[PDB]
Design a protein around this ligand. Structure first.
Ligand SMILES: CCOC(=O)C1CCN(c2cnccn2)CC1
Ligand SMILES: [Cl-]
Ligand SMILES: [Cl-]
Ligand SMILES: [Cl-]
Ligand SMILES: [Cl-]
Ligand SMILES: [Mn+2]
Length: 340
């Protein structure tokens, strides 16, 4: 009747199979205490699938004004209607075009804005918050979430959740670009893939996706989820242990200098959110600094748990809708303390 869990990343990543199992914490807490990320599959089967479609967001919210980002060159597209984003999510012939006349790979910036998700989308808020895995950690009032219980000596997360909406990266050149560049968060996070859109028009794009996963260092069991079970892959993540953050900063200072950037010796390339670690940079991190990460493919309905302090980057394989909630576990509270 389905096994409790399996392993990815050759034994280094816990994958829980039943999102609402009351005994998940017993397997989870040992991996979490060691500063590892955790994957939980099957959250899509708990949700009302009609609430998470791109066509519904366009119909209900299409007249709101927003900014977009061109993922290929970081150009900002200012003050457009949110339908201009949603109507091109899966239909390539409807996307905003760059000067070269190609359809753009776009990210929708800060939408819903700030802490407004609950007010703007109360039925979505309920559906997500009631079906989050590890609820004693992840609910606003969970017994193991210290977010509402800490004094001002700790950086507290904003009221969530936050939605992350972007097209898939397409070409061989796109393999070196991030959807979200390398950064870290002082809080813990759970990120849920609630919808994956595989386009039509330039549909037949299956093969660059396989080369991206393979070159991305994905394990053999992860490759079997496509070929054997035909699940929809959304996004390729690289996550690094919080303890390796300074070694990553040293690599990126050296590369910034090799590329003729002019940066003070103390500047923080992870906080700048300006780098994506491509195959060349990931190999250099392993070979020159001794640092190994976790390469994670987030499929429809996968919840990725990212530990406080852990540097991480995201590369969309197809068009994705992700919803994330921040929390403060007792295992990782040291990462948000304002002294020493
Ligand atoms: C509704 C799921 O049905 C089952 O029979 C479960 C499947 C998942 N599992 C556990 C057990 N402990 C912790 C976490 N998961 C084993 C039994
Ligand atoms: Cl830690
Ligand atoms: Cl709603
Ligand atoms: Cl729990
Ligand atoms: Cl970014
Ligand atoms: Mn993050």
């Amino acid at each position: 009747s389905m096994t409790s869990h399996s392993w990815l990343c050759d034994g280094r990543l816990l994958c829980l199979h039943d999102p609402s199992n009351k005994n998940n914490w017993k397997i989870f807490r040992e991996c979490w205490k060691q500063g590892q990320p955790v994957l939980v599959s099957g959250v899509h089967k708990k949700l009302k699938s009609e609430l998470w479609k791109p066509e519904a967001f366009s119909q209900e919210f299409g007249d709101q004004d927003v900014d977009l980002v061109n993922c290929r060159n970081c150009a900002i597209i200012s003050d457009v209607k949110v339908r201009d984003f949603w109507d091109g999510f899966e239909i390539i012939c409807k996307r905003l075009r760059s000067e070269d006349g190609q359809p753009m790979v776009l990210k929708l910036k800060d939408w819903p804005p700030g802490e407004d998700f609950r007010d703007m989308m109360p039925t979505r808020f309920e559906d997500l918050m009631e079906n989050l895995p590890l609820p004693e950690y992840t609910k606003r009032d969970g017994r193991l979430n210290l977010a509402s219980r800490l004094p001002s000596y700790f950086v507290r997360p904003d009221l969530g959740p936050k939605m992350y909406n972007a097209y898939g990266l397409i070409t061989a050149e796109d393999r070196r670009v991030g959807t979200t560049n390398l950064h870290l968060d002082v809080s813990d996070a759970v990120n849920v893939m609630v919808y994956v859109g595989i386009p039509i028009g330039e549909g037949a794009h299956d093969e660059e996706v396989l080369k991206t996963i393979d070159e991305g260092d994905a394990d053999e069991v992860t490759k079997e989820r496509i070929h054997d079970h035909k699940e929809k892959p959304g996004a390729l993540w690289h996550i690094y242990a919080a303890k390796d953050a300074e070694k990553i900063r040293e690599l990126l200072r050296k590369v910034g200098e090799e590329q003729g950037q002019e940066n003070p010796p103390d500047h923080d390339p992870i906080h700048d959110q300006s780098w994506y670690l491509d195959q060349t940079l990931r190999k250099r991190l392993y070979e020159e600094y001794g640092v190994q990460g976790w390469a994670i493919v987030q499929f429809l309905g996968d919840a990725v748990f990212i530990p406080a302090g852990a540097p991480h980057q995201v590369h969309n394989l197809y068009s994705c809708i992700k919803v994330a909630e921040d929390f403060v576990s007792p295992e990782h509270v040291k990462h948000c303390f304002r002294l020493t």
